[PDB]
């Protein structure tokens, strides 16, 4: 039950992982979660605002 | 053909119309709703007053002067003595609700000034005396606004609050309060400000007398200024509507 | 992958991206090519080190304390909390609610204390670390029967080996931990403010199992927290002021920022 | 935790020492006042002082409340 | 026994290691997750939000709301300066305490474009035109409007829309710049000038203020996580 | 998975779930929605930590004892039993009959004793632990030939290493162990009561293999039991009273519970 | 002869195990047995008792 | 020798670890199982049984 | 939905925004371009600085008084000492270019007055 | 615990060993590569280039 | 594989491989069989040890420094750089621009210092090594709060174990490192020459976590660099002269080479 | 995810490798890169020079 | 790093001690002259000496500039 994942590499390879314990709080940190969604804190308006259009008309 | 400046909001038996509005800020992109079956823990059937509780309540007005530091209101405390919202939180042990906050301030073109209206979650404040904690009377004003100070408060074995405006009572930079849902009342452009806040807590419901989930702060970043002969008395009015309010744990009225 | 610059040329139109209304509460989303001519620049940069995990997942000393093999202080105790130190507290309080597992490490060291005792030959020292969850019996003495650790977790460790390390899961009765609590534990609103039972994680006890020598020795234990598997909600403004207490947010009023000589000065005064 | 651990009582003088016990606290309860009176398993005003009232009825008077592992203190200036 | 050989680094504690360890509570059932608003997954979602800049951080203005106000008035002339500060996002005291600056002071490096938003807060009658300018390094800072006119600028006309945004692009020889002070990785200068005078009618205030907000563009990123020089400690907090 | 609440409304009928007869010996199986209106609450809770395995499978100190490298006490002995300590005994005696494998751990420590001897340099100490099954020869001295351990299991251990650990299976001649025995080993009914040979697990012996130094040293061994692969039958009421002996169930009469001020008092007096 | 099982995880992943010894008293504890049957100690009556019906008639 | 690196926590005794250890009696044959009444598998089967409450716990 | 009063013009590293503009007048209906092969006479290869020369240059400001007669500027002379436009006309013998001229004057509603802005070819005086 | 035996050479530092070690900066993003002229992959590409010989290396 | 000799015989032609023009800047590519008769010799030689990797990938001592458990020097500091030593500096400077990961090793040793203190028994010593990236707070004392290492990488190590070892990636803001910089950091051209911020790698701090004994002890740390995953560009002439400084290329003029007796002497004088 | 490669051997066998970490700066050195191209430093002329032909004509 | 850390001033004598601070340097700034004057948190010629001018106005005079971890010195022979 081995997991093969990709390593952090430069721009312009794999590693193997096996879990030994039974609790899942014993596992290693999730360092490869690169999900973003800034539209909650930024631009949180009810009506959408187009960039080229005047904010108030 | 219409104007994005004119907006009307209708809730229960109340309706607010503004001819000069920037827009509506919606919490964290989340419209308020009721608690779902797969997120609940308390097992009795909830009560939902709807039109009776979800409606606009208008509070006392404050006067914006040329030297005013700012005002704050704990949302649950602000409406704790108002109508059936107050009665329902008096007879119940658990409550849950969101808000629509509308701030109002009009003036003529000559009048200048800018206010920040911000809804801050868990606005835990600090006492002037380092060993002590701020008194409930000092932290909460149910029917009256709480005022900030400009000068620092003196610490002499008291239970006062460090109401310094440039620290926002929370010992943080006041200019960085923009992460929280907010809108700016700029007298030359704006007339009113509107925020729709959802229920924000680490628990599915909470007791509404010993915990204030959110605090409303109004802070003038640019002072109020007018030339002689213009109106000198300029008020600010706050109107708040609970949204999707539900209550559990019916028992004898009272908080102890 | 971070965004890539788009190439633009000259413009003459009624499109106005540079003009907006900040009163709306909205951050403008203008690119550089909205106000100047730009070339095409493919960008290979990545925001991998700015994730909440990488930002929080490093070990940090949160407390250290001493005990001796002889004399009044034979054992040490400490209520687990990350608010005693400044650095991890300030990083954690970027948010209102957090949810994480913990990785716990200990660094135990010993030092010989001055005395007139002679012919001192010391045996190796073993230490016991015991975690008591909130509600259980606590040791009134070094030889207290509670050290039996029938149910309470314990870690025995001998000087010269690797540091001991264990994993602790999310233990909150509430769905998420709380960094801030605007309220009281009493419905009357009397009593201490900003205090609740959501983030109570129990107490830690430490002792020598043997005394080792006929002369005096003093041990120190240092505790290290590492948050794992992190979730966080509601961003908050960073702490401008110097922490004063562990239990509350009290502070001393401080200037918004540093002061320069004038509004056109390009240096820091 | 003691409520208002710093205050000045200016004036029978009632010195409040109301306290709270953490779930972690489980050791024996010991109460001491300083300037005078000690409670172990001036006169205390509450018969049920164990519940959380260590107040007494009469410089600086210090109330020490100790339940392992918690330790709390309160200083009152009687004028 | 399978024959093994232990390599250098055995039994060491490196505070940034990523290993599996035994759980001290076996089979503990955690509290389920509820849906909370405002979840964060990257510190660059916070950096991309505006926050008010204290440009007038001179003397006792810092202990007041006056640090955030930029004064403007009606002059008997034109072309005089309004403000100036350098492009030092994490080191300059104008930026170091803003939401972007606080986040930057945890990282050695930074890269990307920046957005400065300026909002007019005078009477509706008050009219004005302003030149907002950025100069890349190599010469000094401009001392006159004409010198500033030669760099990257916007001419802001005040009217119905009260907010104007000045984008500072990434014009650097390296891909990254040090957050700490450094003459090799110099950033440039940011200035403001009066394109035309402030003009008001009778019975309107001829003195006004302007506000500034700083936010990051979508090509911004940071590197090398480090400790902040902002919080300190002498004894354990209690 | 624990059960989930079912939603109910108002009722008016001859169905009577709240009324029953406790004389039957039957526990009523009423849900909350039998006596009130309830919402639908999916429950994700799990009873994973309440299994007999997790409840019993933690190491526990059951005994500790000393010996010296010189003088009268050169070796230690102990008849294996879990009734000497309070905590594991009380957990185990929730049941009448148990059946488990054992995991055995030892924590051995040494301390230098006061003396006038000079120029003391100590070599490393090795210890021998020997288990003798019931019936075999036992060591009359530290140098006794029985330490040859030709058949008896032995564990040699040098100070500074990991604790020694071994697995022991179910050794009872009977199908299951017995926590309680209402009877005698003599058919006449004379002799000691509550004593039988079902749970006899042999004796443990411990010694220094070398003396190490020219000065006096004293070692202590602590024994830890961990039950594995557990089976249990017939639940029993928990021990209200303080244990007095290891061999029997003797006790001192104690109040059913603590006393309050009255039948309407909401606090503990 | 590796065994892949599921770890304890929260609501709302695998681990691998190999046995090294020959006795089966050497194995690890069985911590995932979630079988329940309370009807022996509770409700142990000869005739079944329906909830809505009177206990004695 | 396969090259290895020992991590923190090596050679420590954590009283709630779950590891395989060598048996001190190899190939011992245990007593078979008989069927006994009243087998327990969860402490919540005991909690779900009634027991009499001492409500009048006042004085003697 | 927008307002014909608001216009933005971007050239090189410069951008001008006006919230109150009548419109844009375009020469004689002719947008500026480069010289074509069938209209040229000089044979060497031309240089085209682009972003370096084509960009907004802002001159000194004049004061409108109640008795001001008016002002004039020769376009080539006005930018003869300004940046790389000036340098390129200094090192070269022939040049060719068009222009975008933006005039700015704001005042309040009470202020009254009207100015003619005109681009006159060959204004020989 | 899988049973193991440590061989001679354990915990030694041989300055020409070739092993994997933990990174002290997890998930650090490096600067991309640009194309530079004159890249070397073998010291024998430098040895194969001429250089002037000092044959008259006598006295001053 | 290296090239193989080709067999040739006698020639008489207008082909002239031995005659060329070195003024072109071109190295002649003549084989031996262009100027003599040769046999066929298959060549099995390999240029495997001449690769830039093998040439550079060995650990090298770059610095060492001391600290004591008592007295004025309680901790050590060092700005990371490979120009302090001669050997790795000279190998690296065969090229203009390099790009590599680093493998870092430490050798920490301790020695007892002379004193009149008596009855000295020493406990084991643990050391802390902390890396501060350029810009962060630095420790003014041994007990400074910055040792909390909330974000800064740290390595704790106890005497008697293997040396500590960690991997560091390429940290340059520029695409490649620079061994040589013909310029100034000031646009004015004033200030220090040959100095830039491209190869700044932060500072290293080292201390005792415990003092261990009542008598004086002095520790030394030695740092070892090993370049990995190497890339290099623009070959440069080797350093003829003896290095004088770490910061610049200053030198003392030296003879092109050694001197013999005459131009026909076959020995070295 | 094991990699089998060839060992350095004499003239006239495999080894196995697995990566354990996630960064790729943690990997071992690349000692088997035997790529050569000396024609940059040597013979860097615009017009090609044949060996048998005179360098200048 | 100090500019020209070795020079001879032959002659009011102006002794230059202009210095630069590495990104690594972050400790407190201390300036000392030797033969006389000390700066900690003969007369210095620059009011903003912190920016990088430790010059003073008046054997061998030594300028010591110390910001942890960097340490720099400059020797000037005044004749």
From Swiss-Prot, chain B:
UniProt-annotated location(s): Virion; Host cytoplasm
Top-level taxon of origin: Viruses
Quaternary structure (record): Interacts with capsid protein VP1 and capsid protein VP3 in the mature capsid.
Job of this protein: Forms an icosahedral capsid of pseudo T=3 symmetry with capsid proteins VP2 and VP3. The capsid is 300 Angstroms in diameter, composed of 60 copies of each capsid protein and enclosing the viral positive strand RNA genome.
Annotated protein name in UniProt: Capsid protein VP2
Natural source organism: Coxsackievirus B3 (strain Nancy)
Residues of the full protein shown: 77 to 332 of 2185
Swiss-Prot record, chains D, M:
Glycan-bearing residues: 57
Annotated Ig-like C2-type domain residues: 1-77
Annotated tissue distribution: Expressed in pancreas, brain, heart, small intestine, testis, prostate and at a lower level in liver and lung. Isoform 5 is ubiquitously expressed. Isoform 3 is expressed in heart, lung and pancreas. In skeletal muscle, isoform 1 is found at the neuromuscular junction and isoform 2 is found in blood vessels. In cardiac muscle, isoform 1 and isoform 2 are found at intercalated disks. In heart expressed in subendothelial layers of the vessel wall but not in the luminal endothelial surface. Expression is elevated in hearts with dilated cardiomyopathy.
Disulfide links within the chain: 17-63
Processing after translation: N-glycosylated.
Record's function text: Component of the epithelial apical junction complex that may function as a homophilic cell adhesion molecule and is essential for tight junction integrity. Also involved in transepithelial migration of leukocytes through adhesive interactions with JAML a transmembrane protein of the plasma membrane of leukocytes. The interaction between both receptors also mediates the activation of gamma-delta T-cells, a subpopulation of T-cells residing in epithelia and involved in tissue homeostasis and repair.
Comment, domains: The Ig-like C2-type 1 domain mediates homodimerization and interaction with JAML. The PDZ-binding motif mediates interaction with MPDZ and MAGI1.
Assembly notes: Monomer. May form homodimer. Interacts with LNX, MAGI1, DLG4, PRKCABP, TJP1 and CTNNB1. Interacts with MPDZ; recruits MPDZ to intercellular contact sites. Interacts with JAML (homodimeric form). Secreted isoform 3, isoform 4 and isoform 5 can interact with the extracellular domain of the receptor.
Protein name listed in UniProt: Coxsackievirus and adenovirus receptor
Gene this chain is encoded by: CXADR
Span of the entire protein shown here: 21 to 136 of 365
Swiss-Prot record, chain I:
Highest taxon in the source lineage: Viruses
Location of the protein in the cell: Virion; Host cytoplasm
Cysteine disulfide partners in this protein: none
Oligomeric form and interacting partners: Interacts with capsid protein VP1 and capsid protein VP3 in the mature capsid.
Protein's job: Forms an icosahedral capsid of pseudo T=3 symmetry with capsid proteins VP2 and VP3. The capsid is 300 Angstroms in diameter, composed of 60 copies of each capsid protein and enclosing the viral positive strand RNA genome.
Name of the molecule in the record: Capsid protein VP2
Native source organism of the sequence: Coxsackievirus B3 (strain Nancy)
Organism ancestry: Viruses, Riboviria, Orthornavirae, Pisuviricota, Pisoniviricetes
């Amino acid at each position: 039950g081995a997991q093969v994942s990709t390593q952090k590499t430069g721009a312009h390879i794999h590693y193997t992982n096996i879990n030994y314990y039974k609790d899942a709080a014993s596992n290693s940190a999730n360092r490869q979660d690169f999900t973003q969604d800034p539209g909650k804190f930024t631009e949180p308006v009810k009506d959408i605002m187009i960039k080229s259009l005047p904010a108030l008309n | 053909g219409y104007s994005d400046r004119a907006r009307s909001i209708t809730l229960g038996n109340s309706t607010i119309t503004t001819q000069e509005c920037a827009n509506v800020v919606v919490g964290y992109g989340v419209w308020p709703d009721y608690l779902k079956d797969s997120e609940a823990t308390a097992e009795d059937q909830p009560t939902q007053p709807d039109v009776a509780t979800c409606r606009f309540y208008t509070l006392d007005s404050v006067q914006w002067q040329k030297t005013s530091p700012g005002w704050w209101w704990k949302l649950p405390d602000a409406l704790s003595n108002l109508g059936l919202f107050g009665q329902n939180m008096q007879y119940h042990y658990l409550g849950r609700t969101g808000y629509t906050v509308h701030v109002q301030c009009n003036a003529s073109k000559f009048h200048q000034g800018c206010l920040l209206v911000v809804c801050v979650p868990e606005a835990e404040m600090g006492c002037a005396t380092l060993d002590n904690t701020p008194s409930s009377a000092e932290l909460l004003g149910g029917d009256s606004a709480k005022e900030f100070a400009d000068k620092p408060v003196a610490s002499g074995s008291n239970k006062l609050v460090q109401r310094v405006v440039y620290n926002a009572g929370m010992g943080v930079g006041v200019g960085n309060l923009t992460i929280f849902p907010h809108q700016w009342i700029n007298l030359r452009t704006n007339n009113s400000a509107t925020i729709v806040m959802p229920y924000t807590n680490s628990v599915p419901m909470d007791n509404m007398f010993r915990h204030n989930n959110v605090t409303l702060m109004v802070i003038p970043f640019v002072p109020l200024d007018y030339c002689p002969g213009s109106t000198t008395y300029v008020p600010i009015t706050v109107t708040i509507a609970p949204m999707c309010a539900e209550y559990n744990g019916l028992r004898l009225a009272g908080h102890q | 992958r971070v965004a890539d610059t788009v190439g633009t040329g000259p413009t003459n139109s009624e499109a106005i991206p540079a003009l907006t209304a900040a009163e709306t509460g909205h951050t403008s989303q203008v690119v550089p090519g909205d106000t100047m001519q730009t070339r095409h620049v493919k960008n290979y940069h990545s925001r991998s080190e700015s994730t909440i995990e990488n930002f929080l997942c490093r070990s940090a000393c949160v407390y250290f304390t001493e005990y001796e093999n002889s004399g009044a202080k034979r054992y040490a105790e400490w209520v687990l909390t990350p608010r005693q130190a400044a650095q991890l507290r300030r990083k954690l309080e970027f948010f209102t609610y957090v949810r994480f597992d913990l990785e716990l490490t200990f660094v135990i060291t010993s030092t010989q204390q001055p005395s007139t005792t002679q012919n001192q030959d010391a045996q190796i020292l073993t230490h016991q670390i015991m975690y008591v969850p909130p509600g259980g019996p606590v040791p009134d003495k070094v030889d207290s029967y509670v050290w039996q650790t029938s149910t309470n977790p314990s870690v025995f460790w001998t000087e010269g080996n690797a540091p001991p390390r264990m994993s602790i899961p999310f233990l909150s009765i509430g769905n998420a931990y709380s960094n801030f609590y605007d309220g009281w534990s009493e419905f009357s609103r009397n009593g201490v403010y900003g205090i609740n039972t959501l983030n109570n994680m129990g107490t830690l006890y430490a002792r020598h199992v043997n005394a080792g020598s006929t002369g005096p020795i003093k041990s120190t234990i240092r505790i290290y927290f590492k948050p794992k598997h992190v979730k966080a909600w509601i961003p908050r403004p960073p702490r401008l002021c110097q922490y004063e207490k562990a239990k509350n947010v009290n502070f001393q009023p401080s200037g918004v920022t540093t002061t320069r000589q004038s509004i056109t000065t390009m240096t820091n005064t | 935790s003691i409520t208002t651990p710093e205050e000045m009582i200016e004036k029978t003088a009632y010195l409040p020492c109301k306290f709270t016990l953490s779930p972690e606290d489980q050791g024996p309860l010991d109460i001491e006042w300083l300037i005078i009176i000690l409670y172990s398993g001036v006169h205390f005003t509450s018969n049920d002082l164990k519940s959380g009232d260590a107040s007494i009825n009469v410089g600086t008077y210090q109330c020490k409340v100790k339940k392992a592992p918690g330790v709390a203190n309160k200083k009152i200036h009687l004028v | 026994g399978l024959p093994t050989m232990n390599t250098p680094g055995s039994c060491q504690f490196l505070t940034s290691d990523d290993f599996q360890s035994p759980s001290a509570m076996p089979q503990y059932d955690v509290t389920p997750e509820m849906r909370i608003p405002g979840e964060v997954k990257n510190l660059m979602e916070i950096a991309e939000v505006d926050s008010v800049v204290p440009v007038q951080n001179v003397g006792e203005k810092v202990n007041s709301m006056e640090a955030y106000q930029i004064p403007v008035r009606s002059n008997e002339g034109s072309g005089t300066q309004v403000f100036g500060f350098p492009l030092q996002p994490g080191y300059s005291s104008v930026f170091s305490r803003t939401l972007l600056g606080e986040i930057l002071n945890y990282y050695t490096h930074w890269s990307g474009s920046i957005k400065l938003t300026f909002m007019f807060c005078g009477s509706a009658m008050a009219t004005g035109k302003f030149l907002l300018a950025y100069s890349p390094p190599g010469a000094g800072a401009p001392t006159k409007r004409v010198d500033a006119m030669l760099g990257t600028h916007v001419v802001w006309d005040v009217g119905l829309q009260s907010s104007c945004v000045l984008c500072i692009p990434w014009i650097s020889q390296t891909h990254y710049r040090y957050v700490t002070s450094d003459e090799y990785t110099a950033g440039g200068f940011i200035t403001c000038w009066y394109q035309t005078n402030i003009v008001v009618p009778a019975d309107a205030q001829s003195s006004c203020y302007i506000m500034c907000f700083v936010s990051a563009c979508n090509d911004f990123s940071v590197r090398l996580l480090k400790d902040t020089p902002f919080i300190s400690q002498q004894n354990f907090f209690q």
